[model samples]
Target: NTLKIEAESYLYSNDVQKEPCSEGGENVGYINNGSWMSYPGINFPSSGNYLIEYRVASAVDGGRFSSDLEAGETVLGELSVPNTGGWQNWTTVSQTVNVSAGTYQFGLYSISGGWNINWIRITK
Candidate 1:
């Protein structure tokens, strides 16, 4: 028997905004916004491949950031953003990976500098 199933998840803006220091000048961005970051619950169903997408913008140059997915205590995939420029000069990155049939957690983090995350999405 073949069991065909489909699942979906979403992430939204946490209304996290802040004034970040910049070489050119001060720029507004998100701060500690959990909406930008996501973590799957321990009971999250999994199977086949999953696609994760997110957009990040920085008001200043050299703003480094990253996003990751974790299952229990193990990391599945980590997406990193290279230093770009102002918010007007933002960029987008995405990744797709296969996961086991189980629950997992996904999150976004700024490794070095500060920035703003517009949105994120997950699908299977």
Candidate 2:
């Protein structure tokens, strides 16, 4: 399975804001620690290696995020965000995780803030 999701298209979000992205669409920005966003109805194929890619940017360092399924009932993976010169200077950060075959509500949680996210791409 493969999916590309826009950050601003989250089904629900907490402590997150939307703004224009350098990539020509809306992005989720101004995230803070404890902020989170959820996307519903993500269906993953057979359990195997899945690549999770996030288009993100930060002016400073120390940004971190985590992924989960079913509102955190099932933890997926986590990754650290790197400084990309400026908030609008985008970069792609990726992590690989093993997922089970099924449909789920995907969630993104900010462990540490100082970054902006434009989109999420997942492939298996």
Candidate 3:
């Protein structure tokens, strides 16, 4: 199963704004560190592990961030995305994640530039 969550729907930290992508697209970008977004009330039908896939890229070293349903030590994990050469050069990175069955707050923490995220997909 797969669920694709859009970047536009994310809630920002502070007054950070998402600017239009250089390739005429819009994403969760426009800053360095100390930036993040949230997707509250995300759903999972069953109590099982899943794959966390992110559609993102960077011009240099790409980007890295932390994720979790509720940001617990056990659940919190690092996500280091790939650099697909340049801005707008999108790439996909994924990881295995464990989650309980239910709706919960999805978070993207400590976002950085060089990382351009289009969306996030959680699946098997």
Candidate 4:
């Protein structure tokens, strides 16, 4: 199963807004200044393998972040969010994760600026 998540729909978040994007509608943006967001209580459905995907864009590099569980210190993967020419130069970045089947917290945080997120998804 694949679940699509709105960036703004996270259980906890800060310093972000819903804005226009390539997906043809508003998505979360201004994800900076130590901002963090979490998607909580997600069902893994007997997770053996899972993939996390982020739809994002930026005009300059040095965008830093992590996708993980529980907390930022326990990172599953780190991404130097790319400079895709402009904010609308949208592309997807994905990471594979392995965890037992359970309901838990998934999170993302901004370590540096210049990255904007549209949406996220977790799939098997």
Candidate 5:
């Protein structure tokens, strides 16, 4: 089985929303780790080579995106998305990764500014 993730948020609100890519639902949470937001427990099916994608927006200021993968230890990967506007307006970002197969946790975080995470998708 393959798992997919995505995020989106509002500039007015500090919370970032996320959900399964297959469900196409919105996230009702926020990620404030001083510099970014994160989503953990993003499982993958026998990871070998996969693609990760995300979209972000902000009404006040744009921010950076990054991820942390943890199965036993933590392996970090940085994801970048162009700042568009509010949740209503967002730009998408994507990256391809080579990972090992196992149950892993992934996180999404903001770097410089504040914004909403629209969604993320992972494919095997």
Candidate 6:
């Protein structure tokens, strides 16, 4: 099974805003260093290795993002974004994490800037 979450639909954010996505709807943009988005009640169905994909775009290199639980006390994964040529040029960067079955608040934190995020897909 899988779950898809819109980046712009975050329950709370710091220094992040929404913008139009090339695919549809909106995405989280202006993600500078220390910016973060939080989504409440994300459920992982079972304890196993899950693929977490971040739909992102960047015009510059050194962009990075990370995921965590409980407001970042428990880190799940992180990725260094590659240059996608344009802000609207999309790519999916992924990482696999071993997580337990539970519902927790998910946090997306920007380690660097110069990027946009459309969505996150979690597959098991």
Question: What C-alpha lDDT do the candidate models reach, one value each?
Answer: 0.48, 0.92, 0.72, 0.80, 0.55, 0.91
TM-scores, one per candidate: 0.52, 0.96, 0.84, 0.88, 0.65, 0.97
Give per-residue CA lDDT, model 4, range 79-104, as digits (tens).
77788999878888988878788777
lDDT for each residue of candidate 5 in 1-124, tens digit (9 for 90 to 100): 4455544432222344344332255643344444444455556667477877765555555455566675225555765545454544666676777877766556554565455565667776
Candidate 6 collision pairs = none
lDDT of 6 by residue, 21-40 (tens): 99999988888999999999
lDDT score at residue 109, model 4, on the 0-100 scale: 84
Q: What stretches of model 1 exceed 4 Å from their correct place?
A: 1-45, 69-72, 82-84, 88-90
What is every candidate's alpha-carbon RMSD to the true fold?
Answer: 8.7, 1.0, 2.4, 1.8, 5.7, 0.7
lDDT (0-100) at residue 75 of candidate 4?
A: 70
Tens digit of lDDT per residue, candidate 2, span 46-75? Answer: 888899999999999999999999988889
Q: After superposition, how far is residue 122 of candidate 5 from its true place, in Å?
A: 0.3
lDDT of candidate 4 vs native? 0.80
- Residue lDDT tens for model 1, 11-60: 43243443433323332365442334444563336677766665556655
Model 4, residue 11: distance off in Å is 2.4
lDDT of 6: 0.91
Rate residue 76 of model 5 by lDDT: 54
Model 4 residue pairs with clashes: none
Q: Highest TM-score: which candidate?
A: 6
Worst lDDT run of 10 residues, candidate 4, spans 67-76
Candidate 6 differs from the real structure by a C-alpha RMSD in angstroms, to one decimal, of 0.7
CA error at residue 48 for candidate 2, angstroms? 1.1
